[model samples]
Target: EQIGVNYGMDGNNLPSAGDVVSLMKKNNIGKMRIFGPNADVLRAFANSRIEVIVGVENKGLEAVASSQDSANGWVNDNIKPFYPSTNIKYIAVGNEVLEMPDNAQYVSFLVPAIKNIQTALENANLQNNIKVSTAHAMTVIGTSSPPSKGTFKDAVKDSMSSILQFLQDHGSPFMANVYPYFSYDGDRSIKLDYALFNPTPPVVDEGLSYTNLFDAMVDAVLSAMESLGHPNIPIVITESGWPSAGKDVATIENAQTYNNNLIKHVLSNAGTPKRPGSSIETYIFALFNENLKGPAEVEKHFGLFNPDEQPVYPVKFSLN
Candidate 1:
C-alpha cells in the first residue's frame, strides 16, 4: 500500500482542486485525508482510485450532536453527493476534539455526533461503505513514556472509554495524531536520530527495544487502549509529519529524512514492535503549508509541499 498524505487547505494560494489531483497522480499517492468535505475537491477526485477520508470540523460538532436531522442534512450536503466516485472511505466526526486544551465542552458531544453520522450513513445505505470515527491527540494519555505503561488521562478516560466502545462496536479504527517532532523538541533527552527513524542507539522499555520514536508512540496508544480493555481495535495515524521550517530542528533535511523514513517503515510492513506484522495506516501531517494557522510558525510549515504545490523536499510516497 502507498503512504497517505493529509490535504490541509489553509493557504490562499493553493493550487486548484484539479491541479492537486494531478499532483497526487504524479507522485503516485493513493490515499488522502481532507479536513472537510470540499465539493470542488471531491468532484475532482471523482472516478479516481485515491481513498479520501473526509472530516467534520470541530465547530460543527455541536449541531450534528444536537439533532439527527442535522446529521442527515450534513451527509446529504457534504458526503452523499460525491462518495463512491470520490472513494470516501471514512468520516472523521471531529478533529482532535478530545484534546483541545481551552475547551472541554466539545469532548462530550463527540460520540453522539459520531453515532448520528453513522446512523445518517446507514439511512443513506452508505454505512457499510463508509466508517465513522474521530481524531484525537497523543495528549489524551496521562503517561506515555514507556510503551507498556501508557494510560489515558483521568479527565478524558470516561469520554475516551465511550469513544473506544463506539469505535469498537462500529468496527472503525481509533485515530490519533502522533507527532514525534514535538516530543523530540520538548525533551533534550530525546535523540533527534531516533525521532527521524535514523540509525540510533535503541531505547529499551520494559523488555522491548525501540529503534524509532514513531513505533514507540504508536505502541503507547496501543497500550493505552489495551489498558482500557479495547485492545483489539486497530489504530490509524490520522496526522503526523515534520515541519520544514520555523523551528531550529524543523529544517528541510530533517523533514525529508523523517518523512522518507516513515514511508519506508510503512512500506516495509515491519509494523511496530508491540504490534508486529500489523498494518497501521498513517497519513502525513499536511499537503501544503497554510499561512493562516497561528500561535506558532511551525504550525504553518508541516506541509510536504509549499503553496505552489512544489515539494519542500522529495519524499517518496510509494516503494516499488
Candidate 2:
C-alpha cells in the first residue's frame, strides 16, 4: 500500500531540501525516490519518517564497481551519516543503464556495481534491511503482447538473467518504470481510455483479463520474469507519470485523470490478473515541472506541485 514519487531537481528554481521534504509530508506522500545521494536531501529526511530510494546514477557506476574500497567509502560517506533516521530503503545502483541508446557502455558494469553495492551493505550490516537493485525501462522486454508471451530482449537476456538471480539471492524486488501515457502516444493501436484507466472492454491476454494498460504493461514484465525462472519477485514501479502538456494529448485534465485514477487503482489492492492479490509498490515519475528538460515543456513530470509551490492539479496521495 506504499505509493511514492520521484523528487526531480533539474530546475534552478527548485526549493530547499527541507522544504521539499515538508511539502511531501504535507500532502501525505509517504515514500520518495532521489536520483543520487544528495547529502542535504538525505539529512533533511532524517527523523522525518519518509522512506526513500537513493540511487547511484550511471555516471558513478564505473567507480563504484571498480573496487570494494570505493563502494565502502561511498557507504561510509553518503549513507553511514544518515542511517535509521533517514529511512533509506533501497540503494539503486543504476537507472535505465542498459535500455535504449543512452547507456550501453554502462551495461557491463551493471552486475558488478550491484554486487559491490550489495557487498558494501553487507559490510555495514545494512544488508538485511536495505535492498540493492536497479531501475529499468520497458525496452528490456523484447516481445510484450498478450502479456504471457513477454520475454527479455536477446541483447539484455544475459544481464537480466544475472540481475534476477541476484534479486532472488538477496530478496529484493525488481524495480521498473512503466509509463502508459508514452505507450499510448507512441502506439496508435492502444486506445487512450485504456491507458487512462477509463472503463473500456478488457484486453484478455492468454486467458488473463486486463482492464488497464498499466496492468498489462506490468504483467508483461512479470510474465517475462516468470519465464526466466523467477516468478515470486515482487515489482516496484520506480517511475511512472503522465505529462500534463508539451506534446500531443498531454493536458492538465488528462494528467490529473491519469494520476488520480493511478492512485485509486494502486491503493485498491486489486492485483493484476497475472499476480492475483499482489499489490504493486509504485513511485510516480516526478515531483514538479522540470522546465530545463525541454523548451516550453510545462508538465512532463509535475506530479503534485509546481516550482512556485503550487498544486498542478488536485490528487489524493493516500486512501481515505
Candidate 3:
C-alpha cells in the first residue's frame, strides 16, 4: 500500500525523471506514473522497484490497432529498449478515449490497440511485466449521480459493452479519471458533504450512507459494470483529486476538505456500500500544480505539491 504520483504531459521537459525518482524515494513514496513512454524517464528509473504506468497518446491509436506488427513497432521504438530496467508496470493505450464528444471515429480502435499491444508484449516475452489498458474521464457515462443507477449513455452503451467484454476476458482493470469537484458543481442539488468526503452523512437508500464522493463514484462504476454483467471486475481510479484554487465558483475550503478526506477515505481501506471490503486501488490525481491546464483557474489547482515540491496544505502524513 505505497503512495503513487503521476507526472504530466511536459514530464520530459520540466523535471528530469531521475530527479522525480530521487525526490519520491527521499519522501518515502514508492510508485511513479508518467504520461508517456519517454526514453529518458524510463532509463532514469531503470532499476528502481517503483511501479510505473506510462501513457500512450491518442493520436497513435490507428497504428496500434491496425495490426500486431504496428503495435510491436510502436513498442520496440517507444518501449522495448527500456525494458528490464524501467519496471514499467502498465501501458495505457490512450487518455480519455471514451469521453470525446466526437468519439465515434476513434473509439472503435481501443480494444484492438489493447489486444495488439498485448500481442506485441507476448511476442517480446514481456507480457508478464507490462499490462495494457486505457483511461476514461468521469464523463464517459451519460449520467452518474445516485451511484446505484449509474449507466453509460444509450449512444455509448454498445461501445462500453464491447470495452467491458474485452476487459473481462483479458483480466484488465477498468480505469477512470474522477473529479468529485466537477460532480458537485455539475448538479445544483448535490450535497456538499458527500462531494467533499466530509463527516456530514447524507441520507440515501436504506443500508447506505454516503459521506464522500469517492465511495459513491466507486459504486457508480460498480453499478455501471453490474448493468453490463461485469460487477466483479476490478476498478481503479487512475486520477482523482480536488483543485487547490479556482474562480469565484470554487472555494478553497472545499478543495482542502475534498483532498484531505479523500486521502483519509482511501487509507481507511473501507469499501462503498455496494461492494463492502472490496480492494480499491487509487492513484491520487497529481503531484504538482499544473499551471498550464484548462477551463478555469480551478482546473489548475489539483496539485498536492507545488512545483518546488512544497505541500500546498500542511498535510500530516502521520495523522489519519
Candidate 4:
C-alpha cells in the first residue's frame, strides 16, 4: 500500500498510492491529498489529470534544510521526472509539524527548506506551476475558545511569522487541520450539536454568542492571523471530517448528521460571520477506514470508505 495504514507501509499486495489515485480517478474523485511523496505514485499519475497535493514529511525538513545537494537530489528524485505530467498543484512542505512537540527544531528548518525547495522549483522552471506551503494543526493558536481572542502561539511566533510571510509572498494558502469533534469531545459539558455542526440551531456560545462552532473556530484562526498582519493570506481546512464510528456517546448517526451538515455549509462559498464573502477550501479527512492506526478508538474510524471501498454512509461522494 502507499502508506503504513492497516496494510504495512511497504506491503506489496495491498493497494498502493497509485492504485488509490487511479481508483479515485476512475470513480471521479477530483482532488487528492497524498500523505507523502511516493515515487510510484508520481509515476502512476503522470498522465492523469487529477489534482494532487504532495506532502512533505516532518523529518524531511532537516534533510532539505541541511544540504542544498540533498535538496537537488530531492528534486531530481521526486520533482523532476514525472512533474508536468502529474498534476501536483501544491507541495505541502510538512504535515502537522507545528503540532509535534519537537517541532521547534524544525521551525528553524522550515524557511530554509522552503527557500531551497523554491530555488529547486525555479531552477527546474516549474515555480509558477507548483506551489510550496506547509500544513499546521489548530494548536498553533494559543487561544481558540472564545473565537474572538484567538491568536498564534507566542512561543513559535518568530518562526511562524516568517513562514507566514514567506507563504504570503509566494501566494500560498495557510493550511490548517481542524476537528470540531476534538474540541467537543474534550469538553464534555458542551452539547453535541456544536461539535456535530448541526444546523438544528446551535446553543449560542454564551461568551461570543456564536451559534456554529465550526465557523467561529475558523474565524477565530482567521482573526488571529489577521491580527498578526497576514490578514490577506488565504486559509484552507486541509483536514476535517466526522468519523462513522466512535464511542456510544459519539454515534455513527451523529457522524453522518455532522458530515452532511458540514457539506451543506462548506459547499457554500460564504465565509463565517466574522470574515464574510471569503472563499473556503476544504479536504475531508480520509477515503478509507484504516485499522492499523495506533490512536484512540474514534481516531481510526475517520474515513468515508469501507475496507471494500464502499461508502460507509451515503452523503454526497465523488471519488474521482
Candidate 5:
C-alpha cells in the first residue's frame, strides 16, 4: 500500500499534473515520484495523502554540489516552497548518476550534491522529515547473480562507499533503480517465469531461497552494501517494473503478471531471504507510457498507465 509510481512527464500527450493527481487519488496511490521539481504537480499534491519524491536533474547537480548557496537556493526554490503542503518525502539527488561515463562531467558531483542538499535541509530544519538519496542503476554492482556474491564495481567503489556512509549517517535509504525486465532481457540463463514473479523453483544461495528475480535482485544489492560493512542501510527501489511493449517477453500478459505479482510480493510483507520480515519501499518505473524517453525502444514502455489514463492491463495498487 506504501508503494509508489513515477509520474514521468516526458510525453506531449500525457495528462496534466492535476489530472494525474486526481487519477492517483482515485486509485489510492500512497506515494508518487517525479523526475524533477514540477511546481504544478507539487501544488496539485497539496493536502493529499500521497507522499512525493522529487528529483534533482544531473544538469543541476554541479550547481548544488559546488556551493552551499546553490544548494540552499535549490531547496528554497524547489522544496521549502512546497513541503508539508506537498507531502514531500525524499529529495532524490540524481538518478543513475555513476552509470554515466567517468569523463561525464556530472558523475563526480553526486555525493557532493547529496551532502550539500542534506545540509540545506538541515538548515531549513527539514532534515528529519525529508531524506536525501540518489537513485543508482544496477550497473554499480559487479556480480549479482548468486545474490550473496554481490560486490560494487571497481569504478564505483569509492563513490558508493561515500554515498553509503552518508546514507547511514543521515538515516536515508540507498535508492536503486532495479529492473528484473532488464536482467531477464540481458541474461540468457534467467527464465521468464522467475523474472515474472511466478512459482519458479527457488534459487538457493547460502541457505537463502530466492523464489523470484525481484527478491534476488534486491538481496544482491543488500549484499553489496553488506560487503561495504553497511548491511543495515535500508533500500528504496526508486524504479522497478516490467515493460508492456517494445521487445520480446514485454507482452501485456507478461507485464500484467509481473507487476501484479510484484505488488503482492512487496505488499504481503514476507521480505527477501536476506532480510526476513522487512517491507521494501518500492516505486514502479512510471505512471504513463512515455513516448519521448530513449535511445532504446524499451525505455519508453515501462509505464503502468497509458497517456489516456487507462491501465495497460489489470494491475492493482493495494495491500495484500
Candidate 6:
C-alpha cells in the first residue's frame, strides 16, 4: 500500500491549496488527508490522481446526526459536486469524538452521524465510492499496558460496540490516531529509544516480545478490537508524527528519524506481533506547522515542514 500525508491547514501563512497539491506531486505523494471538506482544496485536486480523505468538523456532528435530511444535504453540498474530480475516498464523520471529555453529548452523535452520512451517500449513489467512518485517539482504549489487556473505556463501550458493528457491516477500516510521542512524554518510565523505534530493550507481554513502542501500541488496539468481537476489522493509522523543536525531546533529527523508521516499517508490511504479515496503511500527522493549534508548543510543531514551506528534515516519500 502507498503511504499518505495529512495536509492540515490550521496555520495562517501556509501555502494555497494549489501549491500544496503541487508540493505533494513534487514529492511523489499520491495520497493525502484533509481535516474538512474545503471547496478550494477539493477543486484543486480535481483529476489530480491523488486519493483524498476528507473530514467533518466535530461541532457539526449533532446537526448531521439529527436527521437524514441534514446528512443528505451535507453530502450534496460538500461531496457530490466535486467527488469524481477530487477522488474523495473517505468521509470522516468526526475526529476523536470519544476522546473529548467535555463533548459527551457530541459523542452520542458520532456513530449516528456516520450512519446518516452513509445512508445519504447510498441514497446519492456514492456509497460504494465513499466509505464513512470516524477517527479516534489512542485514549479510547482503557488499558494498553500489556498489549493483550487493551479494551475500550467504560464510558464508550456501548457506543463503541455499535460503531464497530457499523464498520464491519460497511467494510470500513478502523481509523486510529496513534502517537508514541505522547506516550513517551507522559511516562518518564518509557525509554527514548523505544519511542524512536531504535534498538531498545524488548518489552515482553504474554510470552511475546516487542522491540518498538509503535507496534506495541497498534497491537493493543488490535487486542481491544478482538475483545470487542471485531478482530478481523482492518485498521488504518489516520495520524502519527513527531514534533520538531518544541519540547526537550522534540527535535528536528528525532522527528526525521521517527518518521523515516515509521515509513520503512509500514512499507515493509511488518505487521504488529498480534497480526503477522498484515499490511497497515498510515498517514503522517501534518504537512505544515499549524500555528493556530493549542497553546502547547509541541502542538504547533508537529508538521514535517515549516510554515514557510521548507522541509524541517529530509523525508523519503517513497522508500524502496
Query: Which 10 successive residues of model 5 have the least lDDT summed?
Result: 99-108
lDDT of 3 by residue, 1-95 (tens): 65666766432234556777776776555666777668888888888777888877787888889888999988887778988777777888887
Q: Runs in model 3 with CA error above 4 Å?
A: 11-13, 102-105, 249-252, 316-320
Candidate 2 per-residue lDDT over residues 1-320, each given as its tens digit: 65799998877788899999889888888899999879999999999899989999898899889999989888878787899899999998999987768788898889999999999988998887799999999999988887888888888889999999999998999999999987898897898999999989998787889999999999899989988999988889998899888777788889998899888788677888888774677898788888677654744455567887798888888887
- Worst 10-residue lDDT window for candidate 2 reads 294-303
Instruction: Estimate the TM-score of every prediction.
Output: 0.97, 0.97, 0.90, 0.86, 0.97, 0.96
Scored by Cα lDDT, where does model 5 land? 0.88
Q: Once model 1 is optimally superposed onto the true structure by TM-score, how far is the C-alpha of residue 123 displaced, in angstroms?
A: 0.8
| Predicted structure 3: lDDT | 0.73
lDDT string for model 4 (1-320, tens) is 01111111322233666677665765555566776667887777777776777776778889988888877677777877877888877777877777467575577678788878878778778889888888888878888867777888887688678888988899988888777877777787777777776544643543434667778778778777887889888776777777766676556687777666665566565567666664456667766767765466776677666656666786654211
lDDT of each: 0.88, 0.87, 0.73, 0.70, 0.88, 0.88
Candidate 1, residue 44: Cα displacement in angstroms equals 0.7
Candidate 4 — which pairs collide?
28-320, 29-319, 29-320, 30-320
Candidate 2 residue runs with Cα over 4 Å from true position: 295-301
- Kindly provide the TM-score of model 5 when superposed on the true structure, using C-alpha atoms: 0.97
What order do you get sorting by lDDT, best first?
A: 1, 5, 6, 2, 3, 4
In model 4, the worst 10-residue window by lDDT is 1-10
Q: Write the per-residue lDDT of candidate 5 for residues 1-320, one digit (tens) a residue.
A: 56788888998899988899899888777899988887888998999879999999888999999999999989989999998888999999988888567426788788899999999998898987999999998989899989999988988899999999999998899999988988999886898889998878999999999999988889889999999999889998889888888897888898899888887788776888999886778888888999998878877888889999988898888873
Output the better candidate (4/5) by TM-score: 5
Could you give candidate 1's per-residue lDDT for residues 1-320 as a string of tens digits? Answer: 87788989887788998998988888888889998878999999999799989999888889999999999999999999997888999999998887677546787778799999999999889988999999888888888888888899888889889889998998999998999998999996999999999999988987788999999998899999999999889999989999988999999999999998888887677888887875568888988898888679998899999888888998788887
